[PDB]
Design a protein around this ligand. Sequence first.
Ligand SMILES: *[C@@H]1O[C@H](CO[C@@H]2O[C@@H](C)[C@@H](O)[C@@H](O)[C@@H]2O)[C@@H](O[C@@H]2O[C@H](CO)[C@@H](O[C@@H]3O[C@H](CO[C@H]4O[C@H](CO)[C@@H](O)[C@H](O)[C@@H]4O)[C@@H](O)[C@H](O[C@H]4O[C@H](CO)[C@@H](O)[C@H](O)[C@@H]4O)[C@@H]3O)[C@H](O)[C@H]2NC(C)=O)[C@H](O)[C@H]1NC(C)=O
Ligand SMILES: *[C@@H]1O[C@H](CO)[C@@H](O[C@@H]2O[C@H](CO)[C@@H](O)[C@H](O)[C@H]2NC(C)=O)[C@H](O)[C@H]1NC(C)=O
Ligand SMILES: *[C@@H]1O[C@H](CO)[C@@H](O[C@@H]2O[C@H](CO)[C@@H](O)[C@H](O)[C@H]2NC(C)=O)[C@H](O)[C@H]1NC(C)=O
Ligand SMILES: *[C@@H]1O[C@H](CO)[C@@H](O)[C@H](O)[C@H]1NC(C)=O
Ligand SMILES: *[C@@H]1O[C@H](CO)[C@@H](O)[C@H](O)[C@H]1NC(C)=O
Ligand SMILES: *[C@@H]1O[C@H](CO)[C@@H](O)[C@H](O)[C@H]1NC(C)=O
Lengths: 177, 104, 117
Amino acid sequence: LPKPSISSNNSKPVEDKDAVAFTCEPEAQNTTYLWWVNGQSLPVSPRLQLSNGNRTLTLFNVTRNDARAYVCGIQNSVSANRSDPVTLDVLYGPDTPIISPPDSSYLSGANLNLSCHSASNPSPQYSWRINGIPQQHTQVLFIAKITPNNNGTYACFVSNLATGRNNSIVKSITVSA
Amino acid sequence: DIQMTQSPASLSASVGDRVTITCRASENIFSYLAWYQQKPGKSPKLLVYNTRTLAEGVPSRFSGSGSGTDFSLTISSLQPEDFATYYCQHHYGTPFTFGSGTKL
Amino acid sequence: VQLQESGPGLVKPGGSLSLSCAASGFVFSSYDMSWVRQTPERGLEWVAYISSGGGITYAPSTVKGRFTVSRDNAKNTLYLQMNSLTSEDTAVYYCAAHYFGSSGPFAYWGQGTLVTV
Ligand SMILES: *[C@@H]1O[C@H](CO[C@@H]2O[C@@H](C)[C@@H](O)[C@@H](O)[C@@H]2O)[C@@H](O[C@@H]2O[C@H](CO)[C@@H](O[C@@H]3O[C@H](CO[C@H]4O[C@H](CO)[C@@H](O)[C@H](O)[C@@H]4O)[C@@H](O)[C@H](O[C@H]4O[C@H](CO)[C@@H](O)[C@H](O)[C@@H]4O)[C@@H]3O)[C@H](O)[C@H]2NC(C)=O)[C@H](O)[C@H]1NC(C)=O
Ligand SMILES: *[C@@H]1O[C@H](CO)[C@@H](O[C@@H]2O[C@H](CO)[C@@H](O)[C@H](O)[C@H]2NC(C)=O)[C@H](O)[C@H]1NC(C)=O
Ligand SMILES: *[C@@H]1O[C@H](CO)[C@@H](O[C@@H]2O[C@H](CO)[C@@H](O)[C@H](O)[C@H]2NC(C)=O)[C@H](O)[C@H]1NC(C)=O
Ligand SMILES: *[C@@H]1O[C@H](CO)[C@@H](O)[C@H](O)[C@H]1NC(C)=O
Ligand SMILES: *[C@@H]1O[C@H](CO)[C@@H](O)[C@H](O)[C@H]1NC(C)=O
Ligand SMILES: *[C@@H]1O[C@H](CO)[C@@H](O)[C@H](O)[C@H]1NC(C)=O
């Protein structure tokens, strides 16, 4: 018996806007099909639906926790056939950016080294603004040999082209001497 | 992985003629395509990044468009300076793959 | 915005070479960079990637190893190391910066250096 194969609605579904579907090839007559989810069979929940007589899988409310391996298997007396595991990639939107040096104050002459982390599925589009004027289009903002009162509000802007949503964090940095 | 194919292999046009270059991706890249213009014997230069924004104050003749698998770049007016060797790149994620290229 | 490349040049196919890329005019540390090589037959292709101050590295699926990347931000110098050269490694190499990280376009290209083996 040929090994089953799997096909999907969307190779790269997006969080909170897309819905995925799964179809396994064999579609044999007088046969029963089942689905394995990371080694677990038939998770009973309205979110996961099975239609066309245990043939098509459907998943709504796609979130970042749906990245689980799915397998379609055919159940017969001697079939014992399961498709090769397939991994799903959820294109979830960017989270709240965090600036790794959480100190709100620095010393004179300290090398400003700010790293902005967003933890999105693709690499987020990073931009840095100082007092509202764009400065760079990178993730790490580096300023060396800072001058007293060159301070202000530094903003990391994080963008995702999959969802288009914004996410900006503004932190106030000042130095006395 | 990701395969980029440029439909116009080569073409010729007169000065002041609207021209279009079309690139296609094997899989789905949302809006990450960019166009690189290379002069003969010169390094490539970036244009139309994120497929809708021009780069570094270049003239507004260039316009990128398209969503999904297919993308296009249009020049409304062609200047006496002959432009050629336009490449399309996806840079959605590693690995990065370029297009075949268009000579005009 | 100056990015000057350098390489040993023509070498024995059984040898090895080390590339270098010096930077000036902009902050080297804050910018991620990568290696793009061009051949008259195949065209343009991407052969290396580096993040800020080391860290995550990526290589093309064609060859899992045989490529090493090392950047020194204090010296503003980015180095690529290759060994076990093959007849298809003849190309012109460019070191190019990045926007927005690893998901952005290739900006600030360099003059580049040719090499054959
Ligand atoms: C600006 O900040 C950058 C990051 O800032 C970090 O976070 C803040 C909050 C502070 O805590 C700051 O101290 C942090 O560094 C900073 O970039 C960092 O630079 C250091 C070196 O100065 C890096 O340390 C090196 O780490 C590697 C780990 O290996 C990586 O790569 C492998 C292979 O890909 C992976 O498998 C690993 O998981 C790691 O991801 C070490 O191997 C390396 O060892 C060196 O030192 C030892 C002696 O201890 C020698 O024996 C070795 O030969 C090496 O020479 C370093 O320890 C650090 O990884 C890097 N951060 C990141 C996120 O990559 C940057 O330098 C700051 N300055 C500027 C101007 O940018
Ligand atoms: C994926 O399956 C669904 C149906 O099973 C289809 O796409 C969705 O169709 C519903 C029906 O109204 C829409 O509400 C959703 O917005 C659709 N999802 C999208 C557009 O992402 C379709 O048959 C399959 N393919 C795609 C691309 O959706
Ligand atoms: C703006 O510059 C003024 C300079 O008058 C800073 O005020 C004082 O600056 C000296 C030397 O830098 C420090 O020793 C004092 O502690 C500062 N006075 C304070 C903090 O009350 C001021 O800090 C700078 N930054 C601002 C106003 O945000
Ligand atoms: C996610 O679930 C909630 C409640 O279960 C529902 O209201 C919402 O419409 C779902 N999201 C999508 C995109 O359907
Ligand atoms: C799937 O098969 C089982 C047992 O045959 C049973 O639940 C039903 O007949 C089929 N459909 C669903 C939705 O379970
Ligand atoms: C939000 O969307 C994009 C960034 O992805 C940007 O063009 C737009 O100006 C942003 N709006 C804000 C930050 O208010």
